[PDB]
Short mmCIF file of C-alpha atoms and ligand atoms in Angstrom, two decimals:
data_model
loop_
_atom_site.label_atom_id
_atom_site.label_comp_id
_atom_site.label_asym_id
_atom_site.label_seq_id
_atom_site.Cartn_x
_atom_site.Cartn_y
_atom_site.Cartn_z
CA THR A 116 1.53 -19.57 -19.00
CA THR A 117 3.92 -16.81 -17.86
CA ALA A 118 6.49 -17.76 -15.17
CA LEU A 119 6.83 -15.52 -12.10
CA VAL A 120 10.21 -14.48 -10.66
CA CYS A 121 10.33 -13.28 -7.06
CA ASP A 122 13.77 -12.25 -5.65
CA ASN A 123 13.32 -11.68 -1.89
CA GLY A 124 16.02 -9.54 -0.22
CA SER A 125 16.74 -8.20 3.26
CA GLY A 126 15.70 -4.70 2.20
CA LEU A 127 13.85 -5.13 -1.12
CA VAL A 128 11.54 -7.55 -2.89
CA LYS A 129 12.12 -7.61 -6.67
CA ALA A 130 9.29 -9.42 -8.46
CA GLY A 131 8.00 -9.76 -11.98
CA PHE A 132 7.52 -11.82 -15.09
CA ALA A 133 9.97 -14.20 -16.78
CA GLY A 134 10.90 -12.67 -20.15
CA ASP A 135 10.97 -9.05 -18.96
CA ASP A 136 14.35 -7.31 -18.73
CA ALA A 137 13.46 -5.75 -15.35
CA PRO A 138 11.29 -6.48 -12.30
CA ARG A 139 7.83 -4.94 -12.49
CA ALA A 140 7.55 -4.49 -8.70
CA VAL A 141 10.30 -3.35 -6.31
CA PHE A 142 9.27 -2.55 -2.72
CA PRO A 143 10.50 -2.86 0.88
CA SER A 144 10.61 -6.27 2.63
CA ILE A 145 8.65 -4.99 5.58
CA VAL A 146 5.48 -6.01 7.36
CA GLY A 147 3.77 -3.53 9.72
CA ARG A 148 1.15 -4.07 12.41
CA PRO A 149 -0.58 -1.44 14.56
CA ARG A 150 0.08 -0.38 18.21
CA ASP A 151 -4.50 -6.87 10.35
CA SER A 152 -1.25 -5.79 8.62
CA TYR A 153 0.44 -3.76 5.85
CA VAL A 154 3.30 -4.54 3.46
CA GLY A 155 5.83 -2.76 1.29
CA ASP A 156 5.42 0.90 0.44
CA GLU A 157 2.18 1.22 2.45
CA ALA A 158 3.86 -0.11 5.64
CA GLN A 159 6.66 2.43 5.08
CA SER A 160 3.99 5.15 4.44
CA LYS A 161 2.36 4.37 7.79
CA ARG A 162 5.59 3.62 9.77
CA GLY A 163 4.75 6.20 12.49
CA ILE A 164 1.73 4.15 13.69
CA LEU A 165 3.16 0.65 12.93
CA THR A 166 5.74 -1.74 14.35
CA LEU A 167 7.72 -2.72 11.25
CA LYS A 168 9.50 -6.08 10.92
CA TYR A 169 12.04 -7.40 8.42
CA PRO A 170 11.26 -11.09 7.84
CA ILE A 171 14.59 -11.59 6.01
CA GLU A 172 17.83 -10.92 7.94
CA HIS A 173 21.21 -11.19 6.18
CA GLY A 174 19.41 -12.82 3.25
CA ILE A 175 17.85 -15.60 5.42
CA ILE A 176 14.10 -15.84 6.14
CA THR A 177 13.66 -15.74 9.95
CA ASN A 178 9.91 -14.87 10.24
CA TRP A 179 7.76 -17.29 8.23
CA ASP A 180 4.33 -15.88 9.17
CA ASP A 181 5.44 -12.43 7.90
CA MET A 182 7.15 -13.98 4.88
CA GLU A 183 3.75 -15.47 3.86
CA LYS A 184 2.16 -11.95 3.94
CA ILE A 185 5.00 -10.54 1.73
CA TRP A 186 4.42 -13.32 -0.81
CA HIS A 187 0.64 -12.85 -0.65
CA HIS A 188 1.12 -9.11 -1.24
CA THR A 189 3.61 -9.74 -4.09
CA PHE A 190 1.19 -12.05 -5.93
CA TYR A 191 -2.22 -10.44 -5.30
CA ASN A 192 -1.47 -6.71 -4.86
CA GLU A 193 1.81 -5.92 -6.68
CA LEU A 194 1.79 -8.34 -9.64
CA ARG A 195 -2.01 -8.72 -9.72
CA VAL A 196 -1.96 -12.47 -10.45
CA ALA A 197 -3.52 -15.70 -9.21
CA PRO A 198 -0.21 -17.89 -7.61
CA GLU A 199 -2.05 -21.08 -8.77
CA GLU A 200 -1.78 -20.39 -12.55
CA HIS A 201 1.92 -19.47 -12.64
CA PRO A 202 5.21 -21.40 -12.21
CA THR A 203 7.16 -19.40 -9.62
CA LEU A 204 10.97 -19.12 -9.38
CA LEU A 205 12.17 -17.96 -5.94
CA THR A 206 15.69 -17.07 -4.88
CA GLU A 207 17.83 -17.81 -1.80
CA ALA A 208 20.98 -16.73 0.03
CA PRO A 209 24.25 -18.66 -0.10
CA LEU A 210 24.59 -21.21 2.78
CA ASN A 211 20.77 -21.11 3.21
CA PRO A 212 19.69 -23.92 5.64
CA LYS A 213 17.88 -27.04 4.28
CA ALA A 214 14.93 -26.38 6.66
CA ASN A 215 14.33 -22.99 4.93
CA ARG A 216 14.38 -24.68 1.46
CA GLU A 217 11.62 -27.15 2.54
CA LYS A 218 9.46 -24.58 4.43
CA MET A 219 9.70 -22.23 1.42
CA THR A 220 8.68 -25.09 -0.89
CA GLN A 221 5.91 -26.25 1.48
CA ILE A 222 4.38 -22.73 1.69
CA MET A 223 4.49 -22.35 -2.15
CA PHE A 224 2.59 -25.64 -2.80
CA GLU A 225 0.36 -25.97 0.32
CA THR A 226 -0.58 -22.27 0.89
CA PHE A 227 -0.25 -20.54 -2.54
CA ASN A 228 -1.07 -23.78 -4.46
CA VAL A 229 1.45 -22.90 -7.25
CA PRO A 230 1.44 -25.27 -10.30
CA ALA A 231 5.28 -25.47 -10.07
CA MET A 232 8.30 -23.81 -8.42
CA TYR A 233 12.09 -23.77 -8.29
CA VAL A 234 14.64 -22.16 -5.93
CA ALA A 235 17.95 -20.79 -7.22
CA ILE A 236 20.96 -19.30 -5.45
CA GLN A 237 21.03 -15.53 -5.93
CA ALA A 238 24.75 -15.28 -6.72
CA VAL A 239 24.44 -18.03 -9.32
CA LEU A 240 21.62 -16.02 -10.98
CA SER A 241 23.80 -12.87 -11.08
CA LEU A 242 26.59 -14.87 -12.68
CA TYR A 243 24.06 -16.18 -15.26
CA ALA A 244 22.96 -12.55 -15.86
CA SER A 245 26.56 -11.78 -16.84
CA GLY A 246 26.73 -14.57 -19.49
CA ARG A 247 28.90 -16.87 -17.32
CA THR A 248 28.69 -20.17 -15.47
CA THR A 249 32.17 -19.89 -13.85
CA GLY A 250 33.38 -16.94 -11.75
CA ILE A 251 33.27 -15.33 -8.33
CA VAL A 252 30.36 -13.05 -7.45
CA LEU A 253 30.47 -10.20 -4.95
CA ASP A 254 26.80 -9.76 -3.91
CA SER A 255 26.24 -6.70 -1.67
CA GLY A 256 22.68 -5.58 -0.86
CA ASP A 257 20.97 -3.90 2.10
CA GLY A 258 21.78 -6.28 4.99
CA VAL A 259 24.68 -8.54 3.90
CA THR A 260 27.63 -8.83 1.50
CA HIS A 261 28.83 -12.25 0.19
CA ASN A 262 31.65 -13.60 -1.96
CA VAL A 263 30.47 -16.70 -3.82
CA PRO A 264 32.89 -18.61 -6.05
CA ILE A 265 31.06 -20.71 -8.63
CA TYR A 266 32.33 -23.47 -10.93
CA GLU A 267 30.19 -24.44 -13.91
CA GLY A 268 26.83 -23.57 -12.32
CA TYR A 269 27.66 -24.71 -8.76
CA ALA A 270 28.45 -22.51 -5.80
CA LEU A 271 31.43 -23.78 -3.79
CA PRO A 272 30.07 -23.67 -0.19
CA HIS A 273 33.47 -24.24 1.52
CA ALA A 274 34.81 -21.00 -0.11
CA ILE A 275 31.91 -18.59 0.53
CA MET A 276 32.73 -15.44 2.56
CA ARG A 277 30.11 -13.41 4.46
CA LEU A 278 30.44 -9.82 5.65
CA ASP A 279 27.64 -8.39 7.88
CA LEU A 280 28.02 -4.92 6.37
CA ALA A 281 25.99 -3.53 3.45
CA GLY A 282 23.75 -0.61 2.27
CA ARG A 283 21.74 -0.15 5.51
CA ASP A 284 25.06 0.42 7.34
CA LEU A 285 26.38 2.74 4.61
CA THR A 286 23.22 4.88 4.90
CA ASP A 287 23.59 4.99 8.70
CA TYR A 288 27.25 5.95 8.26
CA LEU A 289 26.52 8.71 5.69
CA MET A 290 23.93 10.06 8.09
CA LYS A 291 26.46 9.95 11.01
CA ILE A 292 29.33 11.67 9.10
CA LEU A 293 26.91 14.36 7.82
CA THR A 294 26.00 15.24 11.45
CA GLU A 295 29.71 15.24 12.45
CA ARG A 296 30.18 17.83 9.66
CA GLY A 297 27.21 19.87 10.95
CA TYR A 298 24.11 18.74 9.00
CA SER A 299 20.86 17.72 10.77
CA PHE A 300 19.14 14.43 9.82
CA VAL A 301 16.90 13.23 12.65
CA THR A 302 13.49 11.81 11.60
CA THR A 303 12.86 8.51 9.77
CA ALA A 304 11.56 10.63 6.86
CA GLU A 305 14.94 12.41 6.86
CA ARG A 306 16.72 9.04 6.75
CA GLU A 307 15.10 8.33 3.38
CA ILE A 308 16.69 11.55 2.07
CA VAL A 309 20.16 10.39 3.20
CA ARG A 310 19.59 7.06 1.38
CA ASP A 311 18.70 9.15 -1.73
CA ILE A 312 21.88 11.31 -1.36
CA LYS A 313 23.99 8.09 -1.09
CA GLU A 314 22.50 6.63 -4.33
CA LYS A 315 22.99 9.92 -6.28
CA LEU A 316 26.30 11.48 -5.11
CA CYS A 317 28.40 8.77 -3.39
CA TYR A 318 31.30 7.11 -5.29
CA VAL A 319 34.42 5.03 -4.60
CA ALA A 320 37.81 6.75 -4.67
CA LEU A 321 40.56 5.10 -6.72
CA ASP A 322 43.07 6.09 -3.99
CA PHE A 323 41.45 7.06 -0.67
CA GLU A 324 44.27 9.23 0.76
CA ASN A 325 44.88 11.13 -2.52
CA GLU A 326 41.11 11.76 -2.54
CA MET A 327 41.05 12.63 1.21
CA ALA A 328 44.24 14.73 0.72
CA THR A 329 42.66 16.42 -2.37
CA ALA A 330 39.43 16.98 -0.38
CA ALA A 331 41.31 19.07 2.23
CA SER A 332 43.06 21.21 -0.46
CA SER A 333 40.21 21.76 -3.00
CA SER A 334 36.45 22.25 -3.73
CA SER A 335 36.55 20.18 -7.00
CA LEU A 336 34.81 17.16 -5.38
CA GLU A 337 31.83 19.13 -4.02
CA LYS A 338 28.25 18.47 -5.12
CA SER A 339 24.94 20.12 -4.13
CA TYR A 340 21.71 18.30 -3.22
CA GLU A 341 18.26 19.87 -3.04
CA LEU A 342 16.26 18.72 0.00
CA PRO A 343 12.48 18.23 -0.39
CA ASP A 344 11.89 21.68 1.23
CA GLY A 345 13.89 23.54 -1.49
CA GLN A 346 17.04 24.12 0.65
CA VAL A 347 20.33 23.21 -1.07
CA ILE A 348 23.14 21.39 0.83
CA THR A 349 26.77 20.69 -0.27
CA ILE A 350 28.58 17.35 0.39
CA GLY A 351 32.31 16.96 -0.37
CA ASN A 352 34.42 14.08 1.01
CA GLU A 353 31.32 12.27 2.44
CA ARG A 354 30.59 11.18 -1.18
CA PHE A 355 33.70 8.92 -1.22
CA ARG A 356 34.09 8.32 2.55
CA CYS A 357 30.52 6.94 2.67
CA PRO A 358 31.42 3.64 0.42
CA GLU A 359 35.04 3.46 1.64
CA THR A 360 33.58 1.45 4.57
CA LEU A 361 33.18 -1.51 2.19
CA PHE A 362 36.98 -1.49 1.79
CA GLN A 363 37.73 -0.39 5.40
CA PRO A 364 35.09 -1.84 7.75
CA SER A 365 36.87 -0.33 10.80
CA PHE A 366 35.13 2.96 9.77
CA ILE A 367 32.03 1.62 11.57
CA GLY A 368 33.87 -0.36 14.28
CA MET A 369 34.05 -3.76 12.53
CA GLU A 370 37.19 -5.89 12.74
CA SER A 371 36.57 -7.90 9.52
CA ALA A 372 38.38 -7.54 6.21
CA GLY A 373 37.18 -5.38 3.33
CA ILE A 374 35.48 -6.56 0.15
CA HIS A 375 38.81 -6.76 -1.75
CA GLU A 376 40.32 -8.99 0.95
CA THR A 377 37.29 -11.29 1.29
CA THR A 378 37.29 -11.65 -2.50
CA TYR A 379 40.94 -12.67 -2.44
CA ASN A 380 40.42 -15.00 0.54
CA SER A 381 37.46 -16.61 -1.22
CA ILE A 382 39.57 -17.27 -4.32
CA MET A 383 42.45 -18.76 -2.25
CA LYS A 384 39.99 -21.15 -0.52
CA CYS A 385 39.29 -22.70 -3.96
CA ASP A 386 41.20 -25.34 -5.89
CA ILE A 387 44.33 -23.90 -7.55
CA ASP A 388 43.45 -25.06 -11.12
CA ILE A 389 40.32 -22.80 -11.21
CA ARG A 390 41.74 -19.61 -9.60
CA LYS A 391 42.77 -18.13 -12.99
CA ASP A 392 39.12 -18.33 -14.00
CA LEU A 393 37.85 -16.76 -10.78
CA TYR A 394 40.27 -13.81 -11.07
CA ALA A 395 39.22 -13.29 -14.71
CA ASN A 396 35.51 -13.43 -13.79
CA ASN A 397 34.85 -11.23 -10.74
CA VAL A 398 31.17 -10.26 -11.11
CA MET A 399 29.51 -7.55 -8.97
CA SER A 400 25.83 -7.67 -8.05
CA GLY A 401 23.42 -5.96 -5.70
CA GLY A 402 22.53 -2.34 -5.03
CA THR A 403 25.54 -1.65 -2.81
CA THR A 404 27.85 -2.40 -5.78
CA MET A 405 26.32 0.59 -7.68
CA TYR A 406 28.91 3.23 -6.62
CA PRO A 407 30.82 4.68 -9.59
CA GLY A 408 34.53 3.80 -9.47
CA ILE A 409 33.96 0.58 -7.48
CA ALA A 410 35.08 -1.67 -10.41
CA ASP A 411 38.36 0.24 -10.91
CA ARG A 412 39.06 0.23 -7.17
CA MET A 413 38.45 -3.51 -6.90
CA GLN A 414 40.63 -4.01 -10.05
CA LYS A 415 43.45 -2.12 -8.32
CA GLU A 416 43.11 -3.85 -4.91
CA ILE A 417 42.90 -7.42 -6.21
CA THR A 418 45.89 -6.61 -8.49
CA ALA A 419 47.96 -5.72 -5.38
CA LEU A 420 47.07 -9.02 -3.59
CA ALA A 421 47.01 -11.44 -6.54
CA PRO A 422 50.06 -12.81 -8.34
CA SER A 423 50.83 -10.66 -11.41
CA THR A 424 50.70 -13.85 -13.54
CA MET A 425 46.88 -13.67 -13.18
CA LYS A 426 44.62 -11.73 -15.55
CA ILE A 427 42.27 -9.77 -13.25
CA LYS A 428 38.92 -8.63 -14.60
CA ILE A 429 35.96 -7.05 -12.77
CA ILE A 430 32.56 -7.22 -14.47
CA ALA A 431 30.08 -4.70 -13.13
CA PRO A 432 27.18 -4.37 -15.59
CA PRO A 433 25.03 -1.17 -15.38
CA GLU A 434 21.88 -3.21 -14.51
CA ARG A 435 23.59 -5.00 -11.53
CA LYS A 436 21.18 -3.56 -8.96
CA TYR A 437 18.76 -6.22 -10.31
CA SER A 438 21.06 -8.84 -11.84
CA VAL A 439 19.77 -11.59 -9.52
CA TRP A 440 16.26 -10.88 -10.79
CA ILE A 441 17.49 -10.67 -14.42
CA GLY A 442 19.26 -14.03 -13.96
CA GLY A 443 15.97 -15.50 -12.77
CA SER A 444 13.99 -13.97 -15.66
CA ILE A 445 16.48 -15.54 -18.08
CA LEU A 446 16.56 -18.95 -16.39
CA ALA A 447 12.75 -19.25 -16.16
CA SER A 448 12.40 -18.25 -19.85
CA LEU A 449 14.46 -21.21 -21.18
CA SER A 450 12.75 -24.22 -22.76
CA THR A 451 15.61 -26.41 -21.46
CA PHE A 452 14.66 -25.19 -17.97
CA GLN A 453 10.96 -26.19 -18.27
CA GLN A 454 11.77 -29.77 -17.03
CA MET A 455 13.82 -28.54 -14.02
CA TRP A 456 10.65 -27.10 -12.36
CA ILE A 457 9.36 -29.00 -9.32
CA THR A 458 5.71 -29.71 -10.27
CA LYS A 459 2.65 -29.88 -7.95
CA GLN A 460 2.36 -33.63 -8.75
CA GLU A 461 6.03 -34.31 -7.82
CA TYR A 462 5.59 -32.40 -4.54
CA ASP A 463 2.34 -34.27 -3.75
CA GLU A 464 4.22 -37.63 -3.88
CA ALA A 465 7.70 -36.68 -2.51
CA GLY A 466 7.02 -33.84 -0.01
CA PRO A 467 9.17 -30.76 0.84
CA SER A 468 12.48 -32.74 0.65
CA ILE A 469 12.06 -32.92 -3.18
CA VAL A 470 13.71 -29.43 -3.33
CA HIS A 471 17.19 -30.76 -2.36
CA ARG A 472 17.21 -33.28 -5.27
CA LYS A 473 16.12 -30.87 -8.05
CA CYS A 474 17.72 -27.51 -6.93
C1 CV9 B 135 15.00 -11.57 -27.27
O1 CV9 B 135 13.93 -11.13 -26.42
C2 CV9 B 135 12.80 -12.01 -26.30
C3 CV9 B 135 12.90 -12.82 -25.00
O2 CV9 B 135 13.88 -13.85 -25.13
C4 CV9 B 135 15.03 -13.75 -24.27
C5 CV9 B 135 14.64 -13.72 -22.80
C6 CV9 B 135 15.18 -12.79 -22.02
C7 CV9 B 135 14.81 -12.72 -20.62
C8 CV9 B 135 15.27 -11.84 -19.73
C9 CV9 B 135 16.25 -10.72 -19.86
C10 CV9 B 135 16.52 -10.02 -18.72
O3 CV9 B 135 17.44 -9.06 -19.08
C11 CV9 B 135 17.69 -9.26 -20.41
N1 CV9 B 135 16.96 -10.29 -20.93
C12 CV9 B 135 18.68 -8.28 -20.94
C13 CV9 B 135 18.68 -8.35 -22.46
C14 CV9 B 135 20.07 -8.43 -20.25
O4 CV9 B 135 20.60 -7.11 -20.05
C15 CV9 B 135 21.53 -6.55 -20.99
C16 CV9 B 135 21.12 -9.35 -20.90
C17 CV9 B 135 21.26 -10.67 -20.15
O5 CV9 B 135 21.76 -10.45 -18.83
C18 CV9 B 135 22.14 -11.61 -20.95
C19 CV9 B 135 22.47 -12.76 -20.40
C20 CV9 B 135 23.22 -13.78 -21.11
C21 CV9 B 135 23.26 -14.99 -20.55
C22 CV9 B 135 23.94 -16.09 -21.24
C23 CV9 B 135 24.07 -17.34 -20.79
C24 CV9 B 135 23.55 -17.85 -19.45
C25 CV9 B 135 24.80 -18.19 -18.64
C26 CV9 B 135 22.54 -18.99 -19.67
C27 CV9 B 135 22.33 -19.84 -18.38
C28 CV9 B 135 21.16 -19.21 -17.62
C29 CV9 B 135 22.15 -21.35 -18.56
O6 CV9 B 135 23.42 -21.88 -18.94
C30 CV9 B 135 21.69 -22.14 -17.34
C31 CV9 B 135 21.47 -23.63 -17.63
C32 CV9 B 135 20.35 -23.93 -18.62
O7 CV9 B 135 21.11 -24.26 -16.40
O8 CV9 B 135 22.99 -19.61 -20.88
C33 CV9 B 135 22.11 -20.51 -21.60
O9 CV9 B 135 22.49 -21.67 -21.60
C34 CV9 B 135 20.83 -20.25 -22.30
C35 CV9 B 135 20.19 -19.11 -22.61
C36 CV9 B 135 20.53 -17.73 -22.28
C37 CV9 B 135 19.66 -16.77 -22.62
C38 CV9 B 135 19.99 -15.37 -22.34
C39 CV9 B 135 19.34 -14.23 -22.64
C40 CV9 B 135 18.14 -14.03 -23.49
C41 CV9 B 135 18.14 -12.73 -24.26
C42 CV9 B 135 17.19 -14.98 -23.65
C43 CV9 B 135 15.99 -14.91 -24.58
C44 CV9 B 135 15.27 -16.27 -24.52
O10 CV9 B 135 11.67 -13.49 -24.66
C45 CV9 B 135 10.53 -12.63 -24.58
C46 CV9 B 135 9.32 -13.41 -24.08
C47 CV9 B 135 10.31 -12.03 -25.96
O11 CV9 B 135 9.11 -11.26 -25.97
C48 CV9 B 135 11.52 -11.17 -26.32
O12 CV9 B 135 11.35 -10.57 -27.61
C49 CV9 B 135 11.65 -9.18 -27.64
N1 ATP B 136 22.63 3.63 -7.15
C1 ATP B 136 22.91 3.17 -5.91
N2 ATP B 136 24.04 3.51 -5.27
C2 ATP B 136 24.31 3.05 -4.02
N3 ATP B 136 23.50 2.22 -3.33
C3 ATP B 136 22.34 1.79 -3.88
C4 ATP B 136 21.98 2.26 -5.23
N4 ATP B 136 20.81 1.71 -5.53
C5 ATP B 136 20.43 0.94 -4.48
N5 ATP B 136 21.35 0.99 -3.50
C6 ATP B 136 21.25 0.30 -2.20
O1 ATP B 136 21.17 -1.12 -2.31
C7 ATP B 136 20.39 -1.65 -1.23
C8 ATP B 136 19.36 -2.63 -1.81
O2 ATP B 136 20.01 -3.51 -2.73
P1 ATP B 136 19.60 -5.07 -2.93
O3 ATP B 136 18.18 -5.18 -3.40
O4 ATP B 136 20.76 -5.57 -3.76
O5 ATP B 136 19.64 -5.68 -1.45
P2 ATP B 136 18.65 -6.80 -0.88
O6 ATP B 136 18.53 -7.97 -1.82
O7 ATP B 136 17.39 -6.17 -0.36
O8 ATP B 136 19.44 -7.19 0.49
P3 ATP B 136 20.43 -8.44 0.79
O9 ATP B 136 21.03 -8.83 -0.53
O10 ATP B 136 21.42 -7.83 1.75
O11 ATP B 136 19.52 -9.47 1.40
C9 ATP B 136 19.81 -0.45 -0.49
O12 ATP B 136 20.54 -0.19 0.72
C10 ATP B 136 19.98 0.71 -1.46
O13 ATP B 136 20.16 1.99 -0.85
MG1 MG B 137 19.51 -9.85 -2.32
#
């Protein structure tokens, strides 16, 4: 009886088997219909004849009919399993409405007929993936970035910070500053190349101006990238200006504070007797935390805001692109967890509202 772990994101579904150290399936959270329907890589493959939709926006499920197709495709096509023989752990955004929790639970028991399920908060799973139950997570993915302070397994809802700026916006920005330079990147196919360039050559500068100032006076920070058609292109200060937007959101016209400031604000919204612990346990998760140098930069920026009495420590494990999923694979593997599952029998007597009492 293997447990399934499905982490649904705004951009990517990460799904697999409890016990594994990595998700077996990772594909786009997209459903396509013509001008019945296609999902994932095949919807992306046929994007030029389909209307694509993202059923999850800013980590929240907003299209339930399409969400059912993504789950159907995850179970039957990607993982190649029957949903009725496996306990299924799902994940959810911070500050995710109660209605969503019930609908999600309802669909899992009434439509997929799962033997048991549980829903966990994504940031809490990332913290668990780091070997901690207390700390503050920065979760930055494709559609949204969140700061989630957590005390002994429990997210502190009153102190959560949300920033509507993540990887999708960074790719759009890298594309826009590459044109400004003089490169051409027009088609949707070409956009996928820019996303690839961002994941391979972008990084976070320790000091932006010294980097920007060095960029003007030298060719030490240049890197080449081979396009699919053989042609080789050089990118210099776009590498570090691309992810600077996380720290300076005004780069794409947004008034809000940067990830260092939201982190500090989040910590100052919490009770004073736990702040020492939050500062010492800043955990980074999500794909948009993957830029080299991002831990050191955060370390520096928090240090400037925080009292110097505080030990600051940023934990950014190399597997953090999937640390929600890894957290879920760990949690669903534990024998102590096997009672925490909501069972089909419990659902059949309590209804969808059983999820608020057990999760
Ligand atoms: C050893 O490998 C085995 C495998 O066993 C293992 C199953 C592993 C499953 C998934 C996995 C996914 O990625 C990894 N491992 C990597 C090794 C990972 O990358 C670096 C390291 C990982 O990120 C380490 C995390 C450490 C977490 C520590 C504490 C947590 C905060 C939990 C917390 C969730 C709990 O407090 C919640 C509460 C109950 O509500 O602490 C806890 O309390 C209780 C337990 C914590 C267990 C942690 C990890 C392991 C290794 C558990 C074995 C069981 O099982 C498969 C089936 C076998 O086949 C393998 O045999 C090869
Ligand atoms: N090595 C990398 N460097 C930079 N960015 C990366 C890297 N790998 C993945 N990303 C980006 O991370 C994003 C996907 O990450 P993730 O799965 O954490 O988000 P999600 O769960 O789909 O979305 P959200 O958490 O916003 O709902 C994509 O925009 C992708 O380009
Ligand atoms: Mg996510």
